[PDB]
Amino acid sequence: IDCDSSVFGNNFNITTSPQTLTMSGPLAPGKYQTTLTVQALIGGTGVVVGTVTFAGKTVAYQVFDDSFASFDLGTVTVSASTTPSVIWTGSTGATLTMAVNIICKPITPTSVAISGQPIWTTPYAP
Amino acid sequence: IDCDSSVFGNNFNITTSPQTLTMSGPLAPGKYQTTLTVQALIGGTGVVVGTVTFAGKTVAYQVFDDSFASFDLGTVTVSASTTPSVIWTGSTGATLTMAVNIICKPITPTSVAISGQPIWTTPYAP
Amino acid sequence: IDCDSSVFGNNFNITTSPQTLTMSGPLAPGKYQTTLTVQALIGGTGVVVGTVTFAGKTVAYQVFDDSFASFDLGTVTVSASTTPSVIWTGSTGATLTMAVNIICKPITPTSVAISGQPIWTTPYAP
Amino acid sequence: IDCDSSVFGNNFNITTSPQTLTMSGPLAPGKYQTTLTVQALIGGTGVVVGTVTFAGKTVAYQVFDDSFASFDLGTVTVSASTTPSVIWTGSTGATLTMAVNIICKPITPTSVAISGQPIWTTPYAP
Amino acid sequence: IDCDSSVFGNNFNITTSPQTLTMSGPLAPGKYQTTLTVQALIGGTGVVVGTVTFAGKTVAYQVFDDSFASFDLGTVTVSASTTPSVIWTGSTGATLTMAVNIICKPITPTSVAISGQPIWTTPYAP
């Protein structure tokens, strides 16, 4: 019935302000709820600050040792179908592996079940 | 359809009790559901306690090594449009990078789908 | 419209079985959904087990290095308005900083939107 | 109104395949939504794999350094009232403290609020 | 009433691109909401990137020290009953233990309670 799209990428760090075109993501033509998961291991004893821009949105990201963070982001529109992509900034280096996942869902009406019948009603406005 | 606002900031630590005006946040004029994500890497082998005040609300924050914490916070009002900002306190130092993100959503009615029709009803009050 | 109460505390460790009266929490007179966030940094290379009692409820808590854990706890009543407070137990020591946050929400009806109109109904019971 | 039951335990590791009867848990007679929180600190520089069986369900668990994981588990039945208990397996040792929490909730109808009145309806089937 | 299926596995690392047939998972014949939990401890001082493919879906995974990550994934269909299984890729080695859990739920209508009766309605279309 309902659909899904988890577009994803596994990347590296070199230039400040780089794009990362997202792997194997064909399109997200319609409306969607959206989420980010991000984490990045560090080569050596160094700490890394950074920020992640997706679609007019931006996210803070301190790190050292082990990390994992997620973000719900409500109901992003897609005005016209395109490939997913992510711009971001922060310190880069010889070794600082990156892992980033976008998950987006179609918005659908929720099914419901009614309790307490019969249910009161009047023609008149409240 | 629905809107969103993830206002954000990436900062440092010097004075006790400082404000951090939040980056690139124009306004949040209406009612909103709200959330915090906070994490802060440590320069050197030191641990840091701290607390974060947003809007009449305050949050505890122990840390060492790697950290990441989030908080749902229900339905904050915005009486009049302003720039987002965050006051906080705790130990500061030569190196203790900070990363903080606010995400807020408009509150909207949820769409629903009805199951089990036809549905019972009576004019009379229960 | 809807209200909120994030009562909070930032504390230390000395005696077994201590109370910690919670900072700046005036009252929670009515019914509420509730949540805990807890984390505690360790002075030195030591591990700490502990348990946290709130309101007839109790929570397990292993720790070393960095920690952060959260708990939803459904719909706690408040029979009469009081100050928030937390009892707990476990190993204590020279340095083991504690951070604990309670977040509670009023329970309110959810707004809804109806899909699929017109909606079928019959006077007769199913 | 609504009830709750957070049954809990703080334990050790010796035999493979042990039970841990859960502390201070009197009964859960009816239907319930359920959740696990598990974490276990390590004595020494060692890593621990393990799995946790609850009620016909089983859970994977790698660990080293600091850990914390949670699991929603939908709507477990309780055919007849009993004490909570947990079987599990994996490497054990001289020091590997365990912390495990079960939280379960009664399933109740959700209250709702209606938007968009008046609402269309027809006697005829769709 | 409602059912559940937490199929699971605890594994090792050798070849690139291996399958892991999932332990003790008999079938998931119908429609389901789905979730992943993944974490993997590291033998030695090494970091590991990897990606996890389930059902036409793929997930990023940086790691070092301690890790734990989870993913909601909406409403996966099961066209015909089969055993659960997971393909994945990344660096492998002498010691890099893996822990992976799938949790899936039947999709069911939600029960509801009505507030604000009596409820307005008109025969006429809006």
Residue numbers in the entry:
A (entry chain C), B (entry chain C), C (entry chain C), D (entry chain C), E (entry chain C): 244 to 369
Any passages from the paper?
Here, we identified a new strain of OmRV and determined high-resolution structures for this virus using single-particle cryo-electron microscopy. Similar to that of other members of Totiviridae, OmRV-LZ has a major capsid with icosahedral symmetry and a T = 1 lattice comprising 60 dimers composed of MCP-A and MCP-B. The central cross-sectional view of the map with the genome shows at least five visible layers of viral genome RNA packaged inside the capsid.
The result shows that the protrusion of OmRV-LZ is exactly pentameric; C5 symmetry was then applied to the final reconstruction of the protrusion. Overall, the protrusion can be roughly divided into two parts: a head and a stem. The backbone model reveals that the protrusion head is composed of a β-jelly roll including eight β-strands in each subunit. The full atomic model of the protrusion pentamer reveals a channel throughout the middle of the protrusion. The C-terminus of the stem interacts with the tip of the MCP-A, whereas there is no direct interaction between the protrusion and the MCP-B. Only one hydrogen bond was found between Thr365 of each protrusion subunit and Thr1125 of MCP-A, and no salt bridge could be identified.
